[PDB]
């Protein structure tokens, strides 16, 4: 059923587009200045804040880049937003940029300070997918969460308590948790945890176990290809009418869109452009914990590890100066594409028979199997 699912999500994409365009028209930005992932970000956050303000806005004058610090009527923003979505709320839409931010953060940063202070092993990176993602996120917002993500929550919810309505949360938070697991025991053991009203160290210690079980017997976690507002704004402006032509977040749609995107980014004096593009690209598909081998395979070019990556973050801090600042064009194109999955595999070869698709192969017709016998460069982005 390609009617609701493909076209209803198109309608949520149209909203973000339309809105971004309107909002650019207010700031009186240029074309080059609307394609600046920097400005796009600021706008996206202005909105999520207002639906739950001001921000950094970079301008282009003869030669150099000027940063403007601006503020907007928190309600005006909310007004312009609905205008774009037909006066609807389109929580999906806000939630979408809620993820784009997530997926960018799960790749720009490593959240160790928090894992340990919770009592999780820092080496449990690959399980913290969406730890940044506000609880306000929707139902299809939590499905993107890693097993480890859930644990850090319950453990804190439990840790402060064990140190009214709060109960329905805990059980559900576990049901979700449990719905991540895809094996008998895994599934059953989650229940044995959900049994205690005041679950103390008994649970505290047990879930941590299950956290580690997922390192081997992974769960089902959905991945959503969520592109920056500018990319959708630009697309909408170019005529693409997604609600009518359909769109996906786990199909070929997102890759294809990024095959023509003209996104620019601010880049510090000593940073490597190629390295910058890599980052953004990995946030566009939630590939921050993917096997570097495969990421590079599909990417088309080396996908260098975080340590060897030359960049500190895409957003520009108030500390820095503009004099020594310039901007590059982000390389977001990829070689092939792949069905962003949810499954963690089980039996060691996973996704037996599943392959990669050419960017011409619109339909999922002919699959391609990668052979990794090769001089690779690692598997752990972190």
């Amino acid at each position: 059923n390609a009617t609701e699912i493909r076209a209803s999500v198109g309608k949520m994409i149209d909203g973000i587009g339309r809105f971004y365009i309107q909002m650019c028209t207010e700031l009186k930005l240029s074309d080059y200045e609307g394609r600046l992932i920097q400005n796009s970000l600021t706008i996206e956050r202005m909105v999520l804040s207002a639906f739950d303000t001001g921000g950094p806005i970079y301008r282009r004058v003869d030669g150099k880049w000027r940063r403007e610090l601006i503020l907007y009527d928190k309600e005006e923003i909310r007004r312009i937003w609905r205008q774009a979505n037909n006066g609807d709320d389109a929580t999906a839409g806000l939630t979408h940029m809620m993820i784009w931010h997530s997926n960018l953060n799960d790749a720009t940063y490593q959240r160790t300070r928090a894992l340990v202070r919770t009592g999780m092993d820092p080496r449990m990176c690959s399980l913290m997918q969406g730890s940044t993602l506000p609880r306000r996120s929707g139902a299809a917002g939590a499905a993107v969460k890693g097993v480890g993500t859930m644990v850090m929550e319950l453990i804190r919810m439990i840790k402060r308590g064990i140190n009214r309505r709060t109960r329905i949360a805990y059980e559900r938070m576990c049901n979700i948790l449990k719905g991540k697991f895809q094996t008998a025991a895994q599934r059953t053991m989650v229940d044995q945890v959900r049994e205690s009203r005041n679950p103390g160290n008994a649970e505290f210690e047990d879930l941590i176990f299950l956290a580690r079980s997922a390192l081997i017997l992974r769960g089902s976690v959905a991945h959503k290809s969520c592109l920056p507002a500018c990319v959708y704004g630009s697309a909408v402006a170019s005529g693409y009418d997604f609600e009518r032509e359909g769109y996906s977040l786990v199909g070929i749609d997102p890759f294809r869109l990024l095959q023509n995107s003209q996104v620019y980014s601010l880049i510090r004096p000593n940073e490597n452009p190629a390295h910058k593009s890599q980052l953004v690209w990995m946030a566009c598909h939630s590939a921050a914990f993917e096997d570097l081998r495969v990421s590079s395979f599909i990417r088309g070019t080396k996908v260098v590890p975080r340590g060897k990556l030359s960049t500190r973050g895409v957003q520009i801090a108030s500390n820095e100066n503009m004099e020594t600042m310039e901007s590059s064009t982000l390389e977001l194109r990829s070689r092939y594409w792949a069905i962003r999955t949810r499954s963690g595999g089980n039996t060691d070869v996973s996704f037996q028979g599943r392959g990669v698709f050419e960017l011409s192969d619109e339909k999922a017709t002919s699959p391609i199997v990668p052979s990794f016998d090769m001089s690779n460069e690692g598997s752990y982005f972190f």
Partner: peptide, 19 residues
């Protein structure tokens, strides 16, 4: 250490999953 130990899979392909 302080590094990764397993790979979270993002795509559907024939891939030995590292841990």
């Amino acid at each position: 250490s302080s590094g990764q130990i397993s790979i979270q899979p993002t795509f559907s392909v024939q891939r030995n999953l590292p841990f």
